[PDB]
Amino acid sequence: PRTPVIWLHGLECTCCSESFIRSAHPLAKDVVLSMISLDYDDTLMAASGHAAEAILDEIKEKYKGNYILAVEGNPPLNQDGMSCIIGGRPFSEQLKRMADDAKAIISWGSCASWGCVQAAKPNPTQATPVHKFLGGGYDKPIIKVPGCPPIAEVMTGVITYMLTFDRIPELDRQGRPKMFYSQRIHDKCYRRPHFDAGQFVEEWDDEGARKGYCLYKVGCKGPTTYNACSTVRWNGGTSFPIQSGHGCIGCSEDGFWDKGSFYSRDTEMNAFG
Amino acid sequence: PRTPVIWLHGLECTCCSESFIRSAHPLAKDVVLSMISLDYDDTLMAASGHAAEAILDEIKEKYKGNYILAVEGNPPLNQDGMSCIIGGRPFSEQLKRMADDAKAIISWGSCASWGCVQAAKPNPTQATPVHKFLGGGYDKPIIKVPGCPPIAEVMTGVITYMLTFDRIPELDRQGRPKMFYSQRIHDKCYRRPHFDAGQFVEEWDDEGARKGYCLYKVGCKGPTTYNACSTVRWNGGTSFPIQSGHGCIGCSEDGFWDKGSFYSRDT
Amino acid sequence: SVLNTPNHYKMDNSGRRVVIDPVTRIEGHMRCEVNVDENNVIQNAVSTGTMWRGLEVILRGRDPRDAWAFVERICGVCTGCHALASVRAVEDALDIKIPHNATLIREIMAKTLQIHDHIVHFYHLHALDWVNPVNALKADPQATSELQKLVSPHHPMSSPGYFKDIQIRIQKFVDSGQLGIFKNGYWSNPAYKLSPEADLMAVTHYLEALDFQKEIVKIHAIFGGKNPHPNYMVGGVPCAINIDGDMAAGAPINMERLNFVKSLIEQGRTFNTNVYVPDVIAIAAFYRDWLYGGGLSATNVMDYGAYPKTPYDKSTDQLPGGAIINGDWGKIHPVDPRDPEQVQEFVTHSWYKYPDETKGLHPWDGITEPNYELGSKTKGSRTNIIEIDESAKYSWIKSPRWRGHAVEVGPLARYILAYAQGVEYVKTQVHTSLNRFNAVCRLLDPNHKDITDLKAFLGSTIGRTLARALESEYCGDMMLDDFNQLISNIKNGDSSTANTDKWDPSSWPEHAKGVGTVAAPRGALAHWIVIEKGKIKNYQCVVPTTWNGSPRDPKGNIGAFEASLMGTPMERPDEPVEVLRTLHSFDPCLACSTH
Amino acid sequence: SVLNTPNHYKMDNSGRRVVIDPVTRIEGHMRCEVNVDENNVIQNAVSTGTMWRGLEVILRGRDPRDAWAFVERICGVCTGCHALASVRAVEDALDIKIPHNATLIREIMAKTLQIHDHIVHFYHLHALDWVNPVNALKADPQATSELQKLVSPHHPMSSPGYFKDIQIRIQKFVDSGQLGIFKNGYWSNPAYKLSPEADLMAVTHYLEALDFQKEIVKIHAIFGGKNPHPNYMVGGVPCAINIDGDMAAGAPINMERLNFVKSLIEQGRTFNTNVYVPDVIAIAAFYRDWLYGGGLSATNVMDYGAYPKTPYDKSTDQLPGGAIINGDWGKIHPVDPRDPEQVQEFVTHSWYKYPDETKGLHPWDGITEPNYELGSKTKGSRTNIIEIDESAKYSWIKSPRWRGHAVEVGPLARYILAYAQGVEYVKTQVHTSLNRFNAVCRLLDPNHKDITDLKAFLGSTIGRTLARALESEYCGDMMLDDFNQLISNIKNGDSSTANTDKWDPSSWPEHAKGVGTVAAPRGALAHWIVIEKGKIKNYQCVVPTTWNGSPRDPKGNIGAFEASLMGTPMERPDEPVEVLRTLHSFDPCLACSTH
Ligand code: SF4
Ligand code: SF4
Ligand code: F3S
Ligand code: F3S
Ligand SMILES: [C-]#N
Ligand SMILES: [C-]#N
Ligand SMILES: [C-]#N
Ligand SMILES: [C-]#N
Ligand SMILES: [Fe+2]
Ligand SMILES: [Fe+2]
Ligand SMILES: [Mg+2]
């Protein structure tokens, strides 16, 4: 029998669900038919309304302590939580109930990990990442898989790791799997030789742009951003933001929306600053 | 009508033909059915013997001045040229004859471009690259597309450029298309951050190897090698030598077999 | 109560109330409540958007050049369309004209999104309202192959053994007792009308579409870095072109990348023509006697218009816009997103506050101040809604109107508008689709009488679904034309991709306002920006699902979702397949609707 | 002359002489000459390798650690097998044991090569000896679909419309008058026995195989950087493994790379079983009356043996080796590549010199000194060979013998050896394949009497062709096993990939010798190295096509190519379809043969 997965959706844009189904290997079809049991997921699921709710009830008891709770999006705390209503009740109540009997949590994406766009100033809904919502006393692992969205093969790679090797992958201090989040973009960037030579895009579509010069001067946040974009890359290894000519915007990092303008130059560059 | 292409084969291993059919986009099937007319190619063609030779005769005359001559491999000059025999005669005579009425030549791979492995010391057959065999008087473009073999999409990219844009691509001083050969591996290498930090593989399967550290100290020739391996990459963008853990051996560069041990540093 | 709406509906909430919360197989969060009469016919419908994030609020004070990335995150399904609206709105405000190739690449990205979004919507969100996978286990593989060959003769994937292998896989899945995404489906409801063989074909194609969809978005990865959420920028596209020059292999766009795009385009065209369009036609034929769900599409439709063959010349739009009102397809009313008397948003039945709530605000004047407040007739409590009170505020969705009219937006709106404006590609698609539909109907019913009434055929849930598929096909052909134009431009010497004349805010006027429009997958999208001293002073979005999913306005007009449900009989009100089928035909994007 | 060979042939060159130069649809360069009697039956056959490069010479003085990259370039078709032989030879000489994962990854690369090489050989090199693309244009697409469903019920790609679309594309190519690779093919020769429907099915599959083949080699790209010509190293594999640790995404092998490999493996298995194997069986049935070409295969076969389930333990070889001589399948003679009385190479009829040309040299004692010299009975001149003089030196291929015996090598040799040694997987494949063959024959002839004689079945050009396909299927299954073992090793804590104890030449003995063996796609491969003071003193290769394409030895025994043509009738000697079909069934690699 296949590992039960409950995939909840809070305040979100659905990019993490979309990314997941882009996976080249394993295919999403095979993950759902043969690897896990995707027992609840508002995006793909047959049942609605009362029939959907019933599933939650049933899984929760049938598989108490044995389901993975995957969370996309996040709970709002403003508007008495009714800026995200599910079954007539705050999403936060759904999240808490299912968290209580989960084996482990996967915080998909920057929304569940950190807050993402709805949490940017002034955060009208008091959108709150999963780990902060559950607080310091929550006693099960929370695996943060950040990015807006994460890379597809990173998402399915986390799942296949757990299914193949029978353990939670090693996590850094922020809860991110070292499998994918233990280097900065700039630590494995093929444009680095240009950075080193002082060869930059100075203005869009300049000489440097057409040669693939470094994007630091046009705002690349790769120097401060931990992700697999420059190694695994995106959409079956096709590209990543920097390859296609736009700097990293920092989208896996806590607080990236408020770090500064995407076209502001990254900090912490000198070891004598 | 589709552009006539005559693909000759001298002394070779056939890796350039193999690479060509790996092309992800365009597919080889589509190149041959719809883009070019692959009129002669010992590897894939139906006809043999006399029937095969007859096509060369016919294409030459019928398309005089209007076919692209693609060459894989190279002509030997030792053994009276009979270390590469085609139709009972030296390959060099075939090459000369077809070069005389080509519109342009594509020198596929390091064999046709430079000499490759058979030309490494002491070069028993006096294997000679196409441009040197034809000499300084040869009056048509020779497009060198080096590498052992070249990347598949580089090979089909050269052909699609010529068909789409109606010109020979701009070439560097060595005859290589700037489209693909105007940066060194090291100039676009994703392991460069490690080179810069003095983070190297020092011994196979060391800590550095397991973190993807730079391969300079185990002999990577990327600092002196011009190719698209670190940008386009190999086999539908899947990998390249360095990504998979072995240094570049320099395989697109003239003389790479005799530049020293592959595991000795690039100096 | 019985409410007689100005748009000619009688909303009657005295019958039995049915609540659907969550509405699944949408993006985001929705609640729908209906009332049914003693004959199980819907006599009232209530559309509730159940989420809000506040992007309009979050944008205030930020740099207009950054906005696209924020608003792109309105939605990961229609990923990129908000970025495109944004950059266009800023370029409008600042009088920026972009290079040809930037226009084309943006259009290529847009048409990629349309194809991806439409295909995934039909198979992965919609199909389970028409397809019963459990019944597919009853199919004969040889008869399934026969059906396949008739539905789509060119599709190679028809072997009986292939269908049998698919069937074995789904049987294994079911026999496992872990039914996952099929658990608790309404599979015994007679509202499901396909044969076992058609169910098996359709499930087969669901799987083929899940495998296919990841390929087409590689066009976004090439031009935009990644999918979801490709990159954009004000003044051009970031994906600089270098085909033949020094360092070309290191440029974003080079020969190899162009060859890859060509390949991807062709794969998408083939899937449209061989799998998606033929499936929608055939499933429509099985459902030929179920023509409910037309709603407003019968009367009031709108789009801003898109895809001009000549950049910046809307008379050349390949999906021409305007508004048809009161069902008169002979009168195309021009739509101006700048006119304060045209697009207006009301909040009387929404969870927002205005100083003067009698007003509809044009979006340059828009206000987004949350006001979560339940009416005094609510059953339940503030944090436990049992039956929402639709006489008061009942949604996070604002109420957009056009000159005070409620309209439907989306592919069907655009198809009606294009048909009515003499777009020959569209007319041909519609007529040949009708002809194909009637042929498949005659396969199924040899006494079938051909359908000839185009208003009846298009103005339905089936017609809405068909128009979406046809639009996908049209987008694939247009995108190929755009690619060929890009190649031509490069061949004639133009590899330029960005205009930086107005990159620096020192070049901007102190005060500026702009609007950017997009033919987004779900209909008419626009963003309205007000800039002051380099910063965003106001930023208001009105998105397709905002229109369609709208609650009532101060005069009581109902929006497109509510209208579409009125008068639909349900086999089993408590297993509301019909509701889902019709709502899903709009492709609701609830994160979009509320932003 | 009439020459009565010690291996029981009568080579008679008094009949009409037919010259084939070039032999196309091989790797590299070959010339073949035959003589036919008055009944157009071949009574003499002459194998000439028409190229030489001198890799053995070139290696002298170089570092053993570099050798693999040089010898890999012996061949880009069987790309990697020489690298593998090389590192194994150096590791043998220096007593290096590699980690289990290195063993496994090398086997996965080897099996990837087998599959790729076998599929491309059959479709792209061999098929046009059996398949008439012109006749495919006469096929009925509906009857083609029916044939396809019979040949391979599980393959999905069977629609009549698909086969019609393929036909349309070939018709357009023909209609263009630019016939390219099909130009002047022998398409009116009655040696072509397929129905038009089988020809169309097979052309369809040629195109499917051309699209597929580029996928499987992505396994080489992941473990070895690139294909053709993946990287290797002495003591391990360079593709270090890090699944879970710091910087895993930047390691050569991580979780995503493993998932990619799994996907690729399964795609290959599927193509083997659904496309390749069924095609060869079905084509064989159409050729059931054409059982020519056995040659040495049912008397004298050899392989070194490969793929041990327990590393470094040959009694566990999944393709066990040995030599069968004189047709006694009940006696497996052990083969020892170290024994100077076993493998020896003669040059009596080759373009080389030895000090004592009467000797056969074991490869540790081998000599490669070129001697291009034509016999005084040659028709033509040194640079214009009209008819080669096979009584003298007539090839760049040396003459390898095993204890003085001429033997055939290749997948057919391995299948006979494996069958004879009780390998149940192989026994099952042979018997099921014979049954399937006879089933198709009876579909073609209800009056068919089943073929039961295995020596006659397997010992033919058909059998040689079938054995190659079966081997591909077996390699896919074994490769999956290897992958699962690699995952198990990693799960139990072992991610190691290299042994560096002997990396530095200071750790080496001043004198050492070694031999590395491989079950290469075409048969028995070995490299013999002699090391002196850190440098290569001697490096000798004896490759599969060296064995098969061998010229005569001092006693007059003929090799496998020459034997296989003897006794074959030709419909049209000047349109030598039968010669091509049989030579091609050996998959000649002439660059390999001569190195
Ligand atoms: S700043 Fe950005 S583009 Fe430049 S080297 Fe670093 S990560 Fe790459
Ligand atoms: S030496 Fe080789 S591995 Fe290191 S950065 Fe340069 S090219 Fe990359
Ligand atoms: S913007 Fe995000 S997708 Fe990667 S390159 Fe930067 S972390
Ligand atoms: S060895 Fe050759 S394939 Fe590329 S990485 Fe170096 S030029
Ligand atoms: C949104 N479409
Ligand atoms: C979007 N609606
Ligand atoms: C070679 N095999
Ligand atoms: C290889 N022979
Ligand atoms: Fe949207
Ligand atoms: Fe070989
Ligand atoms: Mg708004």
Ligand SMILES: [Mg+2]
């Ligand atoms: Mg040798």
Ligand code: 3NI
């Ligand atoms: Ni959306």
Ligand code: 3NI
């Ligand atoms: Ni070979």
Ligand SMILES: [O]
């Ligand atoms: O969206």
Ligand SMILES: [O]
């Ligand atoms: O959306």
Ligand SMILES: [O]
């Ligand atoms: O949305």
Ligand SMILES: [O]
């Ligand atoms: O080879």
Ligand SMILES: [O]
């Ligand atoms: O070979």
Ligand SMILES: [O]
């Ligand atoms: O070879």
